């Protein structure tokens, strides 16, 4: 997601829906490849132990000084007229300096933004409308002129620009827990196995204490766990190895 060659404009930001997989966040935090990393409402260490139903990863490029406007209940040009975070947003923010890729000699105008809008954008709202902005009551009719301006503006990108204004690629992950079942979960452990000894074993959602010994019984490929006449499991199948 962050490795993608090109990212959408602040107004063009793409929304990716991630579901039905496992997520490992320890590699992103310990990779030291991010300029700034912060979360809202959820700690980074607790994400591995939490299962989320839907994960939306936002992608876009904004100015350095504009990254401070991304947060619950923020203000400013990019926050109100481009992208805003609801007060209840539980996701996280990630940014890193793109001056070594996006910015090129002569300037890159491919990344633009919406400078003017008749009002403030609503939470999680994307408007690509290019309609001319009318400051006053003077009619425009799509023709630039007095009290008529073009809302989209291009970000000046050159390697000689200051570090503060250097373009930063931001990936916003929106964590939303709905009534639908949960799929995405943190990583696993799968420690070593011991046999012919008294130990407390926990397999998937099953726990107990006993001696693990391989027998000649054969469970149906679809049947993971066995049970006796007493409804007590006398054997189990390794969730990893068969």
């Amino acid at each position: 997601v962050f490795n993608a060659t090109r990212f959408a404009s602040v107004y063009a930001w793409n929304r990716k829906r991630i579901s039905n997989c496992v997520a490992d966040y320890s590699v992103l935090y310990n990779s030291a490849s991010f300029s700034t990393f912060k979360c809202y409402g959820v700690s980074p260490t607790k994400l591995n132990d939490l299962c989320f139903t839907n994960v939306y990863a936002d992608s876009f490029v904004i100015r350095g000084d504009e990254v401070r406007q991304i947060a619950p209940g923020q203000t400013g040009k990019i926050a109100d007229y481009n992208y805003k975070l609801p007060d209840d947003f539980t996701g996280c923010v990630i940014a890193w300096n793109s001056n070594n890729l996006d910015s090129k000699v002569g300037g890159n105008y491919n990344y633009r933004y919406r400078l003017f809008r008749k009002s403030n954008l609503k939470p999680f709202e994307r408007d690509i409308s290019t309609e001319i902005y009318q400051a006053g009551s003077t009619p425009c009719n799509g023709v630039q002129g007095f009290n008529c301006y073009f809302p989209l503006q291009s970000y000046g990108f050159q390697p000689t620009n200051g570090v503060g204004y250097q373009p930063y690629r931001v990936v916003v992950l929106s964590f939303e827990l709905l009534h639908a079942p949960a799929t995405v979960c943190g990583p696993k452990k799968s420690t070593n196995l011991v046999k012919n000894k008294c130990v407390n074993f926990n397999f998937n959602g099953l726990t107990g204490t006993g001696v693990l010994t391989e027998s000649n019984k054969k469970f149906l490929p679809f049947q993971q766990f066995g049970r006796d006449i007493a409804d007590t499991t006398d054997a189990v199948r390794d969730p990893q190895t068969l």
Binding site: L115, G136, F146, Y149, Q153
Partner: protein, 106 residues
């Protein structure tokens, strides 16, 4: 509805468009002073004229926002410099002959 909202809007879009042309105009002069070449001498004139004509084009729209209806001090100061037409107030001959005297004396 009031002229104040229209003035602040013209000032917000002016800083962005002026920051891009002003940076390229100053950047052209840097490559010209650091290195003397036929490419830098022309870039300074092109980038210098593009920015010089930018204020002349914005000055026409700046005189359409009187400062009597603006109650903001920071707004009038920004429009105070744009309200000036520079050499546009001078006659066509007196305006073109002025640059010839400055370049001849220099």
């Amino acid at each position: 509805s009031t002229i104040e909202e229209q003035a602040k809007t013209f000032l917000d879009k002016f800083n962005h468009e002026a920051e891009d042309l002003f940076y390229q105009s100053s950047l052209a002069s840097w490559n010209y002073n650091t290195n003397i070449t036929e490419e830098n001498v022309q870039n300074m004139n092109n980038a210098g004229d593009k920015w010089s004509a930018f204020l002349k084009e914005q000055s026409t729209l700046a005189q359409m926002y009187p400062l009597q209806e603006i109650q903001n001090l920071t707004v009038k100061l920004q429009l105070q410099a744009l309200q000036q037409n520079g050499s546009s107030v001078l006659s066509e001959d007196k305006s073109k002959r002025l640059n010839t005297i400055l370049n001849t004396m220099s």
